[PDB]
Amino acid sequence: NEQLAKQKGCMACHDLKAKMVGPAYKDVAAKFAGQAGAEAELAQRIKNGSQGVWGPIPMPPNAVSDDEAQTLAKWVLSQK
Amino acid sequence: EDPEVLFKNKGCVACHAIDTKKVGPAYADVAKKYAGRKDAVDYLAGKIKKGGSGVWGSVPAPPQNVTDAEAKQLAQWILSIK
Numbered sequence: 001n002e003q004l005a006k007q008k009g010c011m012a013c014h015d016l017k018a019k020m021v022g023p024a025y026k027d028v029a030a031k032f033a034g035q036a037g038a039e040a041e042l043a044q045r046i047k048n049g050s051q052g053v054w055g056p057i058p059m060p061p062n063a064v065s066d067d068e069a070q071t072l073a074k075w076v077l078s079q080k
Numbered sequence: 081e082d083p084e085v086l087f088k089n090k091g092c093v094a095c096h097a098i099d100t101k102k103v104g105p106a107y108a109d110v111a112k113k114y115a116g117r118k119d120a121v122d123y124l125a126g127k128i129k130k131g132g133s134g135v136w137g138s139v140p141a142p143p144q145n146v147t148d149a150e151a152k153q154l155a156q157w158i159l160s161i162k
């Protein structure tokens with residue numbers, strides 16, 4: 001069971017559920033830390049889509065305003 | 081709006097987590113690979129205890145400090161996950 005697996009250290013290297021289709025936000029934030037233009041860039045990619053950065057599967061556009069996109073971009077980039 | 085809320089209501093949550101993936105396969109993916117295979121528990125219990133590499137990548141799994149009975153219990157649990 002989960003408790004035994006936690007106890008024995010297994011969860012340091014394993015999760016229960018498969019990786020999600022897109023990149024983890026801590027990885028996105030770390031890639032862009034200290035990079036000029038990152039909030040703009042990500043806002044654009046959240047709004048308009050992205051492929052080829054993290055894998056073969058595209059992110060489709062999301063229907064967000066330049067405000068919702070900026071908000072989310074800032075929050076993503078703060079994940080540490 | 082709060083970002084943790086937009087994360088939820090625009091569907092971002094469906095595709096992104098905060099934390100990075102761990103190095104080994106997810107237990108639900110193990111369960112899927114080995115489903116219906118007669119000797120899967122015994123195979124996994126040995127791997128769990130002794131470690132090994134090559135099945136999921138080049139990264140070797142280290143041996144673990146489990147009894148053979150605990151290794152079997154963990155095997156059975158992992159296979160259970162759907």
Ligand code: HEC
Pocket residue numbers: 005008009010011012013014103104105110124127128132133134135136137138139140141142144145146154155158
């Ligand atoms: C705590 C006792 C556990 C348990 C229950 C499991 N592990 Fe690991 N694991 C790691 C890596 C890199 C792999 C891939 C190895 C390969 O490519 O062959 C695995 C694999 C597994 C499996 C699947 C084995 C298979 O042959 O299909 C299973 C069932 C599994 N593990 C269970 C990495 C690690 C660790 C990194 C330091 C640690 C700790 C553990 N695993 C611990 C456990």
Ligand code: HEC
Pocket residue numbers: 021022023028042045046050051052053054055056057058059060062064072073076087090091092093094095096
């Ligand atoms: C709801 C509005 C969101 C927000 C805030 C983000 N996503 Fe996604 N996303 C997905 C996939 C597969 C990728 C990788 C694409 C590639 O490999 O190029 C991404 C990528 C991202 C990023 C990083 C972009 C960059 O240029 O590095 C960011 C910040 C991001 N997303 C945020 C997959 C999906 C989804 C699957 C259907 C959905 C829904 C979302 N993402 C939604 C959002």
